[PDB]
Amino acid sequence: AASLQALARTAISAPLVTHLYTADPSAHVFDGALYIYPSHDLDAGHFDMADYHVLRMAHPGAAVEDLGQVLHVRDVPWAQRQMWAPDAAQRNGKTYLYFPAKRADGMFQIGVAVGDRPEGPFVAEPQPIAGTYSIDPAVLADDDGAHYLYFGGIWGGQLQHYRDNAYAQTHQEPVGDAPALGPRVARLHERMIDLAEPSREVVILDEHGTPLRADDHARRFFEGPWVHQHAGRYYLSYSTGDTHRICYATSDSPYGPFTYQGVLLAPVVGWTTHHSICLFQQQWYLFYHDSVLSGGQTHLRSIKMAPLAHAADGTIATIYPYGEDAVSPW
Numbered sequence: 071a072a073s074l075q076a077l078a079r080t081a082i083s084a085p086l087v088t089h090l091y092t093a094d095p096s097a098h099v100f101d102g103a104l105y106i107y108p109s110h111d112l113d114a115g116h117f118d119m120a121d122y123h124v125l126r127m128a129h130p131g132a133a134v135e136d137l138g139q140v141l142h143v144r145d146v147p148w149a150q151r152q153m154w155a156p157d158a159a160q161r162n163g164k165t166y167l168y169f170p171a172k173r174a175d176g177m178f179q180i181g182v183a184v185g186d187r188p189e190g191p192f193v194a195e196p197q198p199i200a201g202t203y204s205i206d207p208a209v210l211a212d213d214d215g216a217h218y219l220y221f222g223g224i225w226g227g228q229l230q231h232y233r234d235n236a237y238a239q240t241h242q243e244p245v246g247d248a249p250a251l252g253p254r255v256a257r258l259h260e261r262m263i264d265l266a267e268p269s270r271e272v273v274i275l276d277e278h279g280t281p282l283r284a285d286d287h288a289r290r291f292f293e294g295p296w297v298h299q300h301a302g303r304y305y306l307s308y309s310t311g312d313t314h315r316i317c318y319a320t321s322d323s324p325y326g327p328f329t330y331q332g333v334l335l336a337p338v339v340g341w342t343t344h345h346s347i348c349l350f351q352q353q354w355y356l357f358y359h360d361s362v363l364s365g366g367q368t369h370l371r372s373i374k375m376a377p378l379a380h381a382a383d384g385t386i387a388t389i390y391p392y393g394e395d396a397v398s399p400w
């Protein structure tokens with residue numbers, strides 16, 4: 071109402087684009103430029119996305135280019151609907167677009183599409199990646215040359231229906247003192263369109279080295295994992311869903327276990343929160359989204375960016391998207 075107008079006035083970022091609704095930004099530096107692979111929210115006059123665009127910043131501070139639509143669900147034979155939060159990777163001169171979509175039978179899986187350029191167009195594989203399920207893929211290009219796929223989202227994302235990579239209708243989200251579910255991780259094969267191994271659960275620990283509890287909604291994993299490397303450590307960051315933050319944890323291994331550190335992003339306007347963290351020349355950035363452009367509509371978002379800093383001790387200061395003095399939307 072007027073509480074949202076206050077946030078709009080003190081927002082630290084403006085929508086990087088406004089001619090289309092965008093969400094779940096996955097930022098990468100490919101071929102000397104910053105490419106962003108977001109979802110494309112559609113306004114039906116309800117997360118029913120059907121296609122993906124690719125955005126680019128040629129250099130820091132540059133205007134954002136909309137490189138156009140690069141993949142539509144009609145060219146994904148195994149998928150019926152809901153083209154959700156994607157990501158990209160490069161290897162052997164190819165660019166791969168990883169995306170979650172829903173099969174006709176209602177189950178999410180992660181597919182991949184291949185192109186010869188970062189802007190595509192991408193030709194989707196006929197089937198989804200074997201061993202994948204749930205949503206929100208993130209592909210880490212490790213400094214050592216390997217690529218790792220991270221995925222998972224609870225609630226609507228369906229990760230709660232799986233244990234040890236197998237689906238069960240009676241599998242539900244854990245409660246109380248039971249450990250909360252973590253994202254999945256699997257090294258990718260050199261061909262990039264297949265996993266090189268079955269995925270494993272990524273464990274997030276508290277200050278005492280104990281796994282996060284299911285009843286710890288302030289810190290336990292909800293959706294949208296992202297991993298970046300900095301100062302010899304792996305940083306796992308993710309959304310907490312119902313508590314609306316992007317939190318992060320650290321490990322000396324891409325597989326974890328990751329020890330919880332703190333909140334990386336405070337609550338944004340709109341129920342969902344999703345992000346990526348990417349180094350572009352002289353600056354790390356947090357890419358995120360909110361629903362301010364749409365007037366607070368959770369399903370119609372816009373992506374944003376902000377400078378991010380690692381402190382000398384490796385920690386990352388909380389980013390307040392409408393200022394630290396703002397009344398939090400959640």
Ligand SMILES: O[C@@H]1[C@@H](O)[C@H](O)OC[C@H]1O
Nearest residue numbers: 094109117154155293342
């Ligand atoms: O993947 C995103 C998902 O994490 C969120 O739940 O809803 C929007 C999707 O785009």
Ligand SMILES: [Ca+2]
Nearest residue numbers: 155206207294
């Ligand atoms: Ca993501």
